[PDB]
Amino acid sequence: FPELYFNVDNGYLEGLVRGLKAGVLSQADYLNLVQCETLEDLKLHLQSTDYGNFLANEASPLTVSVIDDKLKEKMVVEFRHMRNHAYEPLASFLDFITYSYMIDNVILLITGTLHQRSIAELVPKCHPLGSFEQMEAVNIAQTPAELYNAILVDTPLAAFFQDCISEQDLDEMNIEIIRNTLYKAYLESFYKFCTLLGGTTADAMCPILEFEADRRAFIITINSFGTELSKEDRAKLFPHCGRLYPEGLAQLARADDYEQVKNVADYYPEYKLLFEGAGSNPGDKTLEDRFFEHEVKLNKLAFLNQFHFGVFYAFVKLKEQECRNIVWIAECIAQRHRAKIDNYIPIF
Amino acid sequence: IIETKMLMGEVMREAAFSLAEAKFTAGDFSTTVIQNVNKAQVKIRAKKDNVAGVTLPVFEHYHEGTDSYELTGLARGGEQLAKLKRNYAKAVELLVELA
Amino acid sequence: RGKLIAVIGDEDTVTGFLLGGIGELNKNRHPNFLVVEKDTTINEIEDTFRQFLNRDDIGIILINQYIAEMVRHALDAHQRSIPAVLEIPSKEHPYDAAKDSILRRAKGMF
Structure with missing residues (x-):
């Protein structure tokens, strides 16, 4: 039944974003990029596909930092052009995609003000999707307390800060605990918001967010065992919208060793296969790389439904993975270390 | 010096390659690392060698335990960042010897 | 200390x-x-280098080989034996021995 309204407002952009997804490097295209000897060959290959002329009007002493920034520039212009068009049922959903970058910009802003550095010096470092609508917080910059009050007014993010961050907490907490506790509130809320967009959007977006919640739980856990995060701190950062919420999260909170994490992952075939898929052996793919491969699988699967906003999220994460693939290839080419170059993740 | 500069070339190639790996799984961690600075986990102490009947100054690699970036990469990339941290620690050990 | x-x-x-x-x-x-x-001027690198080599806390300075060549004048002028300066390679940049300020000072090297 939703098809039968969806194309009234979103039909154009749905066609556009699948069209934009057709403009991604196939497995054969990555297998062509790796055949070469210099970044000039990366230009000449990319000139044959949608990124063509992205290095026109640019200096001849080219660098991988320029390829990275120009691939982000294409990704963000491809996304701004959809966000500026979308109507309210979709426009709120695309704004939830931008929150996955505004959280990191808020951490740069918080980090600058805690170090008394002028916030305007950090605007060029902030990710371009995470642009604040009102720069008056940035123009004032007067204190961390002023920044906190200004964020809570200037930004529609304020509703997430109110649940997890007080002004005293903002000074007392480590910024990496602030980063993750924000992401908990965002991911649980974006999940709840998608379950209000019933049928196809919920049914084929929610698996990606359910996975991201479980990915956060595993990855936060294994990285915490050498660190100040207690059993309560791991639990406080785990997103409660993953499959593991009734039990697995509680066992990961109790865990203190990678074998115990593997024991949790061994209850679910979807996760058992990742931990079997990477032992962190010499010349092996890492466990993190297996999660990126699985994330790409889920995003590809989201393109297999028709009338849903899941393609806009899956598009942004796949273009991010494509940028990450082109940059990784360009590093292995420029650094001459072609031996590991196959560690890009294939996409379509 | 020639031998140690050859070793430095190799450990620096490996460490610089490990930055690409970290940028894969952690995104732009570099801005976070550059902006947040506190205390050095690694410091040098000067020492005297009397070899050949003359005083020659040298440095010793000392380590303070506390990781100034302990929580970096918990969201993503922390496994690859641990490998990167160890590779740059090996680079710093060879550079203290080269100094 | x-x-x-x-x-x-x-x-x-x-x-x-x-x-x-x-x-x-x-x-x-x-x-x-x-x-x-890439847009940093010679005075920013050079004044920083001139500060670092004269500060009391700094015992070693690491310089990227490309920057070390852009500041080569002040770098090769640094004759003090204790505050050491290491020319180091980088991911898109020349190798570790390219025009090295210490290797060039030896007579025994070919």
Whole structure:
């Protein structure tokens, strides 16, 4: 039944974003990029596909930092052009995609003000999707307390800060605990918001967010065992919208060793296969790389439904993975270390 | 010096390659690392060698335990960042010897 | 008392050594390093180098080989035996021995 309204407002952009997804490097295209000897060959290959002329009007002493920034520039212009068009049922959903970058910009802003550095010096470092609508917080910059009050007014993010961050907490907490506790509130809320967009959007977006919640739980856990995060701190950062919420999260909170994490992952075939898929052996793919491969699988699967906003999220994460693939290839080419170059993740 | 500069070339190639790996799984961690600075986990102490009947100054690699970036990469990339941290620690050990 | 290492280099080289544990703020809040952007002027790198080699806390300065060549005049003018200067390679940049200020001083080397 939703098809039968969806194309009234979103039909154009749905066609556009699948069209934009057709403009991604196939497995054969990555297998062509790796055949070469210099970044000039990366230009000449990319000139044959949608990124063509992205290095026109640019200096001849080219660098991988320029390829990275120009691939982000294409990704963000491809996304701004959809966000500026979308109507309210979709426009709120695309704004939830931008929150996955505004959280990191808020951490740069918080980090600058805690170090008394002028916030305007950090605007060029902030990710371009995470642009604040009102720069008056940035123009004032007067204190961390002023920044906190200004964020809570200037930004529609304020509703997430109110649940997890007080002004005293903002000074007392480590910024990496602030980063993750924000992401908990965002991911649980974006999940709840998608379950209000019933049928196809919920049914084929929610698996990606359910996975991201479980990915956060595993990855936060294994990285915490050498660190100040207690059993309560791991639990406080785990997103409660993953499959593991009734039990697995509680066992990961109790865990203190990678074998115990593997024991949790061994209850679910979807996760058992990742931990079997990477032992962190010499010349092996890492466990993190297996999660990126699985994330790409889920995003590809989201393109297999028709009338849903899941393609806009899956598009942004796949273009991010494509940028990450082109940059990784360009590093292995420029650094001459072609031996590991196959560690890009294939996409379509 | 020639031998140690050859070793430095190799450990620096490996460490610089490990930055690409970290940028894969952690995104732009570099801005976070550059902006947040506190205390050095690694410091040098000067020492005297009397070899050949003359005083020659040298440095010793000392380590303070506390990781100034302990929580970096918990969201993503922390496994690859641990490998990167160890590779740059090996680079710093060879550079203290080269100094 | 000890001393600390310092860095003059691109974002990636600086980031690498910061994760190596190299970074400390001085009591005056000034860091022990400079990040060099492509648009950085010779005076920024050179005045920083001239500061670092004369500060009391810094015992070693690491310079990216490309920057070390852009500041070659002040670098080869640095004759003090204790505050050591290391010319280091980087991911898109020349090799470790390219025009090296110490290797060039030996008569025994070919």
